[PDB]
Amino acid sequence: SEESQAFQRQLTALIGYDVTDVSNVHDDELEFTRRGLVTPRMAEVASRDPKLYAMHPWVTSKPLPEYLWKKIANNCIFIVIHRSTTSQTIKVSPDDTPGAILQSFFTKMASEQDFVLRVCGRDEYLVGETPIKNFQWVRHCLKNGEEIHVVLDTPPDPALDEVRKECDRKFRVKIRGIDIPVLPTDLTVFVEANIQHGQQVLCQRRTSPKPFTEEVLWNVWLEFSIKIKDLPKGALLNLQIYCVQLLYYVNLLLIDHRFLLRRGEYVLHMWQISGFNADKLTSATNPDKENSMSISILLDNEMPNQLRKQLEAIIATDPLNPLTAEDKELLWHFRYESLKHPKAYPKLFSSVKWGQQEIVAKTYQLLARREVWDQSALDVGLTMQLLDCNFSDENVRAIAVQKLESLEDDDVLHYLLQLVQAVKFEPYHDSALARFLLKRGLRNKRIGHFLFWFLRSEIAQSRHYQQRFAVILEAYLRGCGTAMLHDFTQQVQVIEMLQKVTLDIKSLSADVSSQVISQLKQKLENLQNSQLPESFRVPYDPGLKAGALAIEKCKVMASKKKPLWLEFKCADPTALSNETIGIIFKHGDDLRQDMLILQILRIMESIWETESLDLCLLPYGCISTGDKIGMIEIVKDATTIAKIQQSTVGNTGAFKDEVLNHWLKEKSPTEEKFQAAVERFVYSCAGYCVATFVLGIGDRHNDNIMITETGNLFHIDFGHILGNNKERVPFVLTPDFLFVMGTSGKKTSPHFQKFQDICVKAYLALRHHTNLLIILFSMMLMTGMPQLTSKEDIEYIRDALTVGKNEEDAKKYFLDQIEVCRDKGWTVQFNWFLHLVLG
Ligand SMILES: Nc1ncc(-c2nc(N3CCOCC3)nc3c2CCN3c2cccnc2)cn1
Structure with a gap:
């Protein structure tokens, strides 16, 4: 408790935001979620294998592509094993288990003390009941014409990743008034109040346009056409101020995390509007209480072949083909025929009238009979499509998260960035998806690693979503174990350190001066002395561990943003080279954009491995660390x-x-x-x-x-x-x-x-x-x-x-x-x- 209060302070430095700072909530949904996530976390932390969690074999079930078979000659692979210089090459079969390879080195080339095979110069282990071909490091060694070099050393103590014990009334809303402490001609303004589900406005009301002054009261009730009983879970009261032009918005879930209608008084700080965008949809109120428009409010209380062809032709169209009202009544009327075709769930569920309780009911009985969806093979594109902004119902979204359950880590890794991003379309903070991301993070250190940096990337630069993600990161960090907590500490310490230098050096110049190269040299020389930790995981390549700064080679680059070119000596002495680890640190570019694109590039590479193509892209590492700040891998x-x-x-x-x-x-x-x-x-x-x-x-x-x-x-x-x-x-x-x-x-x-x-x-x-x-x-x-x-x-x-x-x-x-x-x-x-x- 005295001890445990300090722990939370650590979490907070790792997280980059204090998940207990309760200034900015008009309710307790966050805490409820922080409280909800304890079970799934402890479940997965209890469920996982310690050995296989500790060494985290990175493997795949996908079949070895043609272009890598036609690089194997006479069905053998040459594993070069090391020890203390005592190295010996070995012909191994692609279908050999790695324990069954130790059988060759140990029990062939002249009770026992179990050891295991680690990749030379990396936190990467070839363990577990999987054939040598099916390990990604191997496939990578093949594909780039390299040689599989491994050290024969001991397992990591799997006790280093344990963790600390622990009515029919029409809905109405009273618009009291709006409040901006400073309002920068004259102006008129009205409050627009939309009732929304998944970017469909179910119902709309406006206020009368009053003059625009630092305070503007209405006291008007806005009665809506929709009945209280007709409101679907996940419906948002969305409030917006216009002047014709939108100036501010905020949202509030009408039904809350407990299935309760939202009673009572609310004062809501709102978001300004620059220049849809997932920020428009957040349930999060603007934390900046002294410069932000507020709003105050109160709440109290078998078919024709011609048609089949038309149905089929609708189901065939792309995801951006809009549905006419004609198309939607067809889908809905023939909903059971539509239920047989998975490709068509998006359009079918986009044809529900969610603002009508009895239809929503029908939709749920129509989801009780989803045998075909459950059996069908996972389409990720389809699965993703039910987790985008047009689907706000949780049961609908639950079936998409179901399909993701059957993804293997390798695949989860390809879609990770954009699944995390998809949380921004969740109505509530506690969802099937957010829990999914949590389980897979905790099941696998590799997924875990990148989750951390994906979450922490948003936390650092989204006011709109920092809190929600903070609770997801927090939950995960209480499950990874002491080792990772320790690794994450080291990497955070380092990148904060190097972020300082980047900004400093940027200020000091408007080409480059001799004085700046000096300044860099000095500042970077100091950092090296005491401040830097011993080593650290490279965030974009968690298997690689950087060591000391090769100060000689570090410089500042000749752009107008003056990024930092930095090189590091590798920290694993079993590394079969003296080649440095190169990292660019830059302020000025929004590298969140670079992330989404590089990861699409990685997705395309995997679309091509399915058709035996390999187009040799180099989508280098990129981790966006905060606002217009991040690191970039150096391709040597x-x-x-x-x-x-x-x-x-x-x-x-x-x-x-x-x-x-x-x-x-x-x-x-x-x-x-x-x-x-x-x-x-x-x-x-x-x-x-x-x-x-x-x-x-x-x-x-x-x-x-x-x-x-x-x-x-x-x-x-x-x-x-x-x-x-x-x-x-x-x-x-x-x-x-x-x-x-x-x-x-x-x-x-x-x-x-x-x-x-x-x-x-x-x-x-x-x-x-x-x-x-x-x-x-x-x-x-x-x-x-x-x-x-x-x-x-x-x-x-x-x-x-x-x-x-x-x-x-x-x-x-x-x-x-x-x-x-x-x-x-x-x-x-x-x-x-x-x-x-x-x-
Ligand atoms: N947003 C942004 N992203 C990348 C770069 C950049 N990256 C890299 N990398 C080094 C090779 O590995 C890949 C990365 N080199 C760069 C840039 C900008 C200019 N530049 C460069 C490096 C060396 C010579 N000439 C130009 C600059 N800006």
């Missing part, structure tokens, strides 16, 4: 396409076609790896060409396009590029690119033919998962892109994915897009150089 041996041109040509001039290829060959040691490098370029250029085209970020300056010194090409800096007579492109396929593939003007090559057929295989792979990408893209815009003004923004994705077009004309459509890049040439890049130098 890489520079920009621009700087490569600046070597030969220089500061300005005619951007030449010869340079890229020369730089490639000039870096390759032999003409064996160069032709791999070129192969890599071909594949990597296509991947990014397609990925970026579909995401709408294909038109980039070559300053923001990069290439490794083994031919891997990759884009960077994804912030605020989705903005809104000028020359454009679908993607950057410049003459320098083409020159490396072997073409000019309208010529052709085999490498170009490989390119053209890689794209289309890629581009139609994505279109196989049209619906999935449409949802992910839609969610990305709402929860992470400020400037999400229109839904028209979302539609871009459907056009690019050419929905409602056959596989083949879609083939030709994409070839027309590449042809444009050929016909546009160097001009757009030149316009970018012009734009990025001339105002």
